[PDB]
Amino acid sequence: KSIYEQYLQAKADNPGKYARDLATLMGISEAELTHSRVSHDAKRLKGDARALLAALEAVGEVKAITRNTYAVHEQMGRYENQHLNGHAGLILNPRNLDLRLFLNQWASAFTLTEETRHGVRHSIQFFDHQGDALHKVYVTEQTDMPAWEALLAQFITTENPELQLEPLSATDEAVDAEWRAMTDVHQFFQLLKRNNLTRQQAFRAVGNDLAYQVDNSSLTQLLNIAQQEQNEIMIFVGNRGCVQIFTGMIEKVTPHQDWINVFNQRFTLHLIETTIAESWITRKPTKDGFVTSLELFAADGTQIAQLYGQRTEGQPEQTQWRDQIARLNNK
């Protein structure tokens, strides 16, 4: 059986599975799975991530998907307001497509056209040096098709070379003082690196008024309170090369088995609630007051997702958000 034939057998034996999870069963990366689908339902793209992302501005509204093993973030939007470079880049559209990119992690790209039950799905899919998915873009009803098709005609190549996979990869009191002296939420990144800590290390290092644990049911409680109250919140989901940010209201929250889901007209969250090992409340000072977040971690320390209240520069977080956080149980 070729890799593609193994895929077809894996798919027949597991018709409920994401391609990601089929790859796992097969003992390969999702990128390698996609590579085997080329000249079947996929094609290789001329890959340069920057060039592809820049070209996507032309296609108008699409659906963007970023995930980690624990959470999937799906958002309607456009690839506008781009500021790309290698270590840190932006696609800056608050409430629509709002991405933070580490482009040096971006290795390969493919397009897929699949007959899928619902219908035909068209997509562009980006993978990292380990072959894991970074980001996927799906055609939707509002997508500018002539531009999508023109883009693909410009980027598809017949050259499908083998993927070049790469292997992986201060005192408590001083950390607490560093944190209290922070003025921008972004300085937290620096605190961690300069002091050599894991978020979970830093959280434990500081005082309980700055960071404390809450029950693992807290996410679902919070999403439901938010759904009821209709206040604007922020939901961050990342992987090694991409962070995708939702800002808006919660329209519907629904569990399904181990999953907790948010179902909005323009945003979908799927999160495996049972994998939440630690749930932290953190309060980081800024020029505009303390910013309060709920940060979720899996057993291995993976950052599942983070939640914040809506906020723009020069404004405080809403009291409403703080009130909602205060309703969570202390563990």
3-class SS letters over 241-258: CEEEEEEECCCCEEEECC
- Three-class SS state of 237: strand
Which amino acid appears at position 151 of this protein?
Answer: L
Cβ–Cβ < 8 Å for 232, 245: no
Distance in angstroms (rounded) separating the CA atoms of residues 86 and 67: 20
Breaks, C-N > 2.5 A, in the chain lie after: 169
**CA torsion 74→76→80→83, rounded to 10°?**
-10
Obtained via which technique?
X-ray
Distance in angstroms (rounded) separating the CA atoms of residues 322 and 236: 18
Distance in angstroms (rounded) separating the CA atoms of residues 172 and 252: 41
- Domain 80-107+169-250+272-331: which topology? Heme iron utilization protein-like fold (3.40.1570)
- Three-class SS state of 311: coil
Residue-level length of the chain: 331
CATH architecture of 1-79+108-168+251-271: 3-Layer(aba) Sandwich (3.40)
The number of CA neighbours under 13 Å toward the Cβ of 103 is: 19
Residue among 156, 119, 154 nearest 139 (CA): 119
User: Cα 125 to chain center, whole Å?
Assistant: 14
Residue 17 tokens read as 């599975």
Distance in angstroms (rounded) separating the CA atoms of residues 80 and 53: 10
Cβ–Cβ < 8 Å for 279, 215: yes
The strand pairing partners of 278, in sequence order, are 297
Distance in angstroms (rounded) separating the CA atoms of residues 202 and 110: 39
Residue among 167, 183, 197, 226 nearest 301 (CA): 197
Contacts (Cβ under 8 Å, ≥6 apart) of 159: 44
- Three-class SS state of 124: strand
Contacts (Cβ under 8 Å, ≥6 apart) of 122: 111, 112, 113, 138, 139, 148
End-to-end CA distance of the chain: 51
The number of CA neighbours under 13 Å toward the Cβ of 90 is: 7
Torsion-angle region of residue 244: left (phi > 0), alpha (psi -120 to 50) or beta?
Answer: beta
Residue 296 tokens read as 């979720």
The number of CA neighbours under 13 Å toward the Cβ of 62 is: 25
To what resolution in angstroms was this structure determined? 1.9
Distance in angstroms (rounded) separating the CA atoms of residues 102 and 91: 12
User: Cα 273 to chain center, whole Å?
Assistant: 16
Domain assignments of the chain as residue spans, ordered by start: 1-79+108-168+251-271, 80-107+169-250+272-331
Domains 1-79+108-168+251-271 and 80-107+169-250+272-331 share a fold: yes
Cβ–Cβ < 8 Å for 131, 30: yes
Q: Please state, as a whole number, how many other Cβ atoms lie within 10 Å of the Cβ of residue 132.
A: 20
Q: Which pairs from 149-157 meet CB under 8 Å and 24+ separation?
A: 150/58, 151/55, 151/56, 151/58, 151/59, 152/43, 152/111, 154/55, 155/45, 155/46, 155/51, 155/52, 155/55, 155/109, 155/111, 156/43, 156/44, 156/45, 156/46, 156/111, 157/43, 157/44, 157/45, 157/46
